[PDB]
Design a protein around this ligand. Structure first.
Ligand SMILES: NC(=O)c1ccc[n+]([C@@H]2O[C@H](COP(=O)([O-])OP(=O)(O)OC[C@H]3O[C@@H](n4cnc5c(N)ncnc54)[C@H](OP(=O)(O)O)[C@@H]3O)[C@@H](O)[C@H]2O)c1
Ligand SMILES: NC(=O)c1ccc[n+]([C@@H]2O[C@H](COP(=O)([O-])OP(=O)(O)OC[C@H]3O[C@@H](n4cnc5c(N)ncnc54)[C@H](OP(=O)(O)O)[C@@H]3O)[C@@H](O)[C@H]2O)c1
Ligand SMILES: C[C@@H]1CCN(Cc2ccccc2)CC1=O
Ligand SMILES: C[C@@H]1CCN(Cc2ccccc2)CC1=O
Ligand SMILES: C[C@@H]1CCN(Cc2ccccc2)CC1=O
Ligand SMILES: C[C@@H]1CCN(Cc2ccccc2)CC1=O
Lengths: 288, 290
């Protein structure tokens, strides 16, 4: 039984706690709301009064909090991380990973690795589970056996910030897929159709879209914006989604997409493909 | 003689793809386009170019329309006053009510029948059996046009209701607009960070097919009004905010504004603990641009 500490017992933190218990370690936990540890006490888990007491109990510290800001608040009075390895599974930006790595190095930590869990809690540890890890290969290799408790890990880079970079890119795709899906189900539901029958009809079409993504990535890399689906036509179809929604009394998402396509047309990029939109983003810090 | 007579109105990206599919399947084609020069590649293959929309419709018993919009369709059919003995196949993207408006316009003018279709692939994939076109309108009219329409791929008759193909088109294109908004954001981030877009597409591929798998479960939750799970909107909104900050760190713009705005309002209305299924009632109960 290796000693492990866990900071954070939210939806994901409790899923992590159960995986670590199942795999046979001596777990110490801390959470702002100590009552979230109730389901772990029967399984032989120690609840530490403070973040400092939690970190003192183990050589390996797992963190799964809401955000970077909560992480820095929680680590404020954790003064001695000498001989400790930090595994940070908290979502944030590439620079926020560098900021926590620096905070823990300043306090004597042996090593920092960052992970992005890419499944909901119920899939953690199951065969469908993937976690992206970044940081020094020797530190990943040191932790690989512990980390197997939460499912498959993918070492994506020795650069501490890269798991968060890739996390933020993949969650952009997830955000967009869910924005389109919520809009779709709102339309079909208000129109009196069955959402589950709609999902069956849709799923072929959605897997076809996923097959197009690598061709689009190649066009973006190669700056090849010519094809058979110009932004003028795409924008006309997005405008018809708004009017379909208005006709039904349903609200309208995809506003940022309409605004960036509208400006692309004004810049004379109306004849380009969807690849044409990437340069609209890469050259200007703006919320569309 | 042998080959069926077919008229096509519109020779844009998709209209030209249709023209080539109809030629290849062995039909006798008459075309009209605002820009007559778009027919140059069809004239060798033996197609007739009509001077006006009316003369085009006069040449054939079956009329295919593939124009930009309803507004352009209405304008283009302004002087098409006689549709007696003509079946109308409208493949122009528009709203459910615009499909009803065109069906009524062509009835008034004596059309035999009207079906609406939504092509769900780019022009280069038209004619592949795997390319699906959704068709709505009278079953008998669809069944009589099924052999002609097999030129452009596999057709799926979704409803006798003329407006249904456009309803389902607008819903499927909502998903495509979302997917592409997220994909453009993702490629802007990884590109500006100096990563390879093509290796990122490969890394991403598993993760995106996993999401398609989650959609029927979410649809069930929305139908059953089950909004409780392990991925609360407060946590999802924090992650979306970190996409904005990641982008700002790279000097890159940010999309997904409507998604941040509707999740913020959910959190404000006490639905911060709910799953993504909890957003659907935010849309269904209020006409609003987020
Ligand atoms: N849930 C998922 O589906 C999912 C999937 C992939 C990744 N993740 C990532 O996992 C991380 C944790 O998310 P979660 O789903 O566990 O979120 P959650 O259920 O909302 O839990 C958030 C955690 O942060 C703590 N926290 C929030 N504000 C705090 C504060 N001001 N001070 C101290 N602690 C505070 C909470 O403590 P209390 O219990 O006291 O509120 C809880 O431990 C996030 O970075 C998220 O992006 C989640
Ligand atoms: N990937 C795709 O291209 C795709 C996929 C699925 C469905 N669709 C649907 O197919 C339809 C046709 O799109 P497309 O790709 O062919 O677009 P496109 O290449 O922009 O062509 C638009 C067509 O409409 C004509 N047009 C535009 N404004 C006009 C006006 N004011 N008066 C008369 N004609 C006018 C154009 O004539 P000119 O040639 O003279 O400009 C052209 O024939 C759309 O409803 C679209 O949503 C397209
Ligand atoms: C697959 C899981 C499911 C919850 N996701 C939370 C989330 C964050 C941002 C946008 C949508 C969903 C993180 C994941 O990667
Ligand atoms: C709207 C987007 C623009 C890029 N297209 C890429 C593509 C995919 C398959 C075949 C050709 C082009 C897919 C689309 O329809
Ligand atoms: C794949 C093709 C590309 C043009 N599409 C129009 C469109 C509309 C909204 C958002 C993106 C693309 C329809 C399609 O099925
Ligand atoms: C962020 C969204 C919220 C609904 N989730 C549905 C889901 C998918 C698989 C297993 C459980 C729940 C997927 C997500 O992660």
């Amino acid at each position: 039984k290796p000693h492990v500490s866990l900071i954070g017992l939210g939806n994901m933190g409790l899923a992590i706690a159960n995986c670590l218990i199942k795999s046979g370690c001596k777990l110490t936990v801390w959470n702002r709301s100590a009552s979230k540890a109730a389901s772990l006490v029967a399984q032989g888990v120690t609840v530490a009064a403070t973040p400092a007491e939690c970190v003192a109990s183990s050589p390996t510290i797992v963190i799964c909090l809401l955000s970077y800001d909560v992480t820095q608040q929680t680590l404020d009075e954790v003064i001695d991380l000498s001989g400790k390895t930090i595994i940070n599974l908290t979502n944030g930006t590439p620079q926020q990973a560098v900021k926590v790595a620096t905070l823990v190095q300043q306090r004597g930590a042996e090593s920092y690795i960052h992970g992005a869990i890419m499944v909901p809690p119920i899939l953690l540890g199951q065969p469908s589970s993937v976690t992206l890890i970044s940081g020094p290969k020797t530190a990943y290799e040191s932790q690989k056996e512990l980390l197997s408790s939460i499912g498959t890990t993918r070492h994506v880079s020795d650069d501490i910030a890269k798991a968060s970079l890739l996390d933020n890119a993949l969650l952009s795709i997830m955000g967009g897929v869910f924005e389109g899906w919520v809009q779709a189900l709102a339309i079909v539901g208000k129109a009196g159709e069955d959402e589950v029958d709609f999902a069956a009809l849709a799923s072929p079409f959605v897997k076809s879209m996923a097959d197009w993504l690598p061709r689009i990535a190649g066009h973006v890399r190669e700056k090849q914006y010519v094809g058979g689906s110009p932004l003028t036509m795409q924008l006309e179809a997005l405008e018809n989604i708004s009017e379909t929604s208005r006709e039904l009394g349903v609200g309208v998402l995809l506003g940022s997409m309409r605004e960036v396509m509208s400006e692309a047309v004004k810049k004379g990029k109306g004849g380009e493909s969807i690849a044409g939109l990437v340069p609209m983003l890469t050259e200007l810090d703006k919320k569309w």
